[PDB]
Design a protein around this ligand. Structure first.
Ligand SMILES: O=c1ccn([C@@H]2O[C@H](COP(=O)(O)OP(=O)(O)OP(=O)(O)OP(=O)(O)OC[C@H]3O[C@H](n4ccc(=O)[nH]c4=O)[C@H](O)[C@H]3O)[C@@H](O)[C@H]2O)c(=O)[nH]1
Ligand SMILES: [Mn+2]
Ligand SMILES: [Mn+2]
Length: 269
């Protein structure tokens, strides 16, 4: 079976309880995770140890909090106490865990399922070939010995409009924001990097990225996490918003792909 779970955010106990509910069995089943494995919840260390141990039985994409953790580890960014990352950062296997994390994808594609997953979704300004090329480019910098330089460059809100002519810092920053920070778009597809509200509460003319027809979403289903104020609802057919805010006192959501059946684990906090 194929299971897709939204943002875990250190909620190890809820993750394991949900996997036990569906009797997740590596070797018979595969788990897809939308990223943001870490921060806010108490168990980021246990989450990373477990997910790394799954190997080929898990298909992860990196989220914005996973990248922030890497930046803290590399000394690029300051540790925020509310993220509760210190047990992971101080663990004796922190190097092993975080060198594994930075080699994971930003984009997962399964052609037989016609299924795409990224942390924030797929901007409507991208076709599939462009999304693949951009994912490959940023995965290459994150997996290289020089990844702290890119982590430092990644911060920023501009440019917010895609062009194949984009180069350099702006190109990488756009790619990172599209895959890991996107929520709202302007009508032409341009990213808005400020509004984090639910679609009903957003100022006009902002609309969800998935409300703008794009070439990937016309051919593939898209699963994503990230947008907790969406509460996993309000999406079109073929769009699966899996982040139901477990670390915020909401729920952890698991979707089984074969029958589109949902399973929910209440937050323990
Ligand atoms: O039910 C909710 C949950 C959260 N929020 C607010 O939205 C912000 C993002 O949290 P969130 O989980 O929705 O997304 P995260 O990726 O985990 O964190 P983020 O760094 O704020 O993302 P961006 O990088 O800006 O993209 C949070 O600070 C809260 O103030 C709500 O209003 N209602
Ligand atoms: Mn998140
Ligand atoms: Mn996120």
């Amino acid at each position: 079976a194929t299971y897709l779970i939204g943002d875990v955010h250190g909620c190890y106990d809820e993750l394991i309880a949900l996997l036990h509910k569906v009797e997740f069995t590596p070797g018979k089943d595969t788990l897809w995770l939308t990223g943001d494995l870490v921060a806010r919840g108490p168990g980021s260390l246990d989450v990373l140890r477990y997910v790394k141990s799954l190997g080929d039985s898990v298909r992860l994409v990196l989220g914005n909090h996973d990248l922030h953790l890497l930046a803290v580890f590399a000394g690029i960014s300051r540790n925020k106490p509310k993220d509760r990352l210190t047990p992971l950062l101080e663990a004796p296997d922190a190097d092993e865990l975080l060198n594994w994390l930075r080699r994971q994808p930003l984009l997962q594609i399964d052609e037989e399922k016609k299924l795409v997953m990224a942390h924030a979704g797929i901007t409507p300004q991208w076709d599939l070939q462009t999304a693949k090329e951009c994912a490959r480019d940023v995965e290459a910098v994150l997996s290289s010995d020089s990844y702290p330089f890119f982590l430092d460059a990644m911060y920023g809100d501009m440019p917010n409009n895609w062009s194949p002519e984009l180069r350099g810092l702006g190109r990488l920053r756009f790619i990172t924001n599209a895959f890991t920070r996107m929520r709202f778009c302007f009508p032409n597809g341009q990213l808005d990097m400020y509004s984090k509200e639910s679609p009903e509460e957003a100022p006009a003319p902002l609309k969800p990225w998935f409300a703008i027809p794009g070439p990937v979403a016309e051919e593939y289903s898209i699963a994503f996490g990230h947008w907790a104020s969406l509460e996993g609802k309000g999406t079109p057919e073929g769009i699966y918003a899996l982040d139901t805010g477990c670390c915020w006192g909401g729920t952890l959501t698991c979707l089984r792909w074969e029958d589109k059946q949902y399973f929910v684990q209440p937050s323990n906090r």
